[PDB]
């Protein structure tokens, strides 16, 4: 919903969805290049948390 001025009011759901999609895309790009397994563990765990 747009309030007065250039700012746009944000809802909680959009922020969480943005976080999840950002982490998913990061893990996708990082996995395509066969990154070391230590990194992918932390990324997978944090995606689980998200």
């Amino acid at each position: 919903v747009p309030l007065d001025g250039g700012r746009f009011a944000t809802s909680d759901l959009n922020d969480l969805y943005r976080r999840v999609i950002n982490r998913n895309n990061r893990l996708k790009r990082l996995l395509d290049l066969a990154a070391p397994d230590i990194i992918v563990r932390n990324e997978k765990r944090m995606l689980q948390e998200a």
Binding site: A35, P36, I38
Partner: protein, 237 residues
Amino acid sequence: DIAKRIEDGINQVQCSVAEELAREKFAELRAQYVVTRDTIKAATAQEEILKLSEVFKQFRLVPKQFDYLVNSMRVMMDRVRTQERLIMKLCVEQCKMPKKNFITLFTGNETSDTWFNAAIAMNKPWSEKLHDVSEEVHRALQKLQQIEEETGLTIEQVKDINRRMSIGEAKARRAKKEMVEANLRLVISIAKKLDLIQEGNIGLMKAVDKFEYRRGYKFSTYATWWIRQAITRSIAD
């Protein structure tokens, strides 16, 4: 020093596997490849397969060929394990077995279709009434026998070969994963020159697994090449 253990594991896996331009090296293989067949067709069998397997390791052509041989011998153990798990789901699953008896029963019989017959001898009321599953047990054996025959090598030696090649691969991967994780501080320091930080360590594994003991340019500086390769052209990628 750590790379020496990796090379030893590679040698062990090579021993397990082996148990004109591309023909000059193959000449060393074929100098006794046909000479070993009659000697092992009957001591000297081991003595000469040692020489047959050692020349294959003298010159390394392509690691992809080694991987090809690895999966070629892996499909055999894969179907052996498939038969094992099929027998397990026949017996232990629908029965209430402790699964310990197969060390006494299955591991000593293999081709012998008598271990399931002997299961009645030691009680096991579930094995007392094998009946339908007994037919269901040894009917899959009528696959295992000709599988073993077409393999041409004994089951116990198959398991031993798989164990030693697995030991070699496990040691190699253990060394790799136990000395890659300690090389992150240098990656951070060089990448400071977060996506850039991660592309600093994407080449870390390459420069680490490429580092040999016949080298002697500093491993930090030896990796500098590949971490700066990320900054060289792919920084804008």
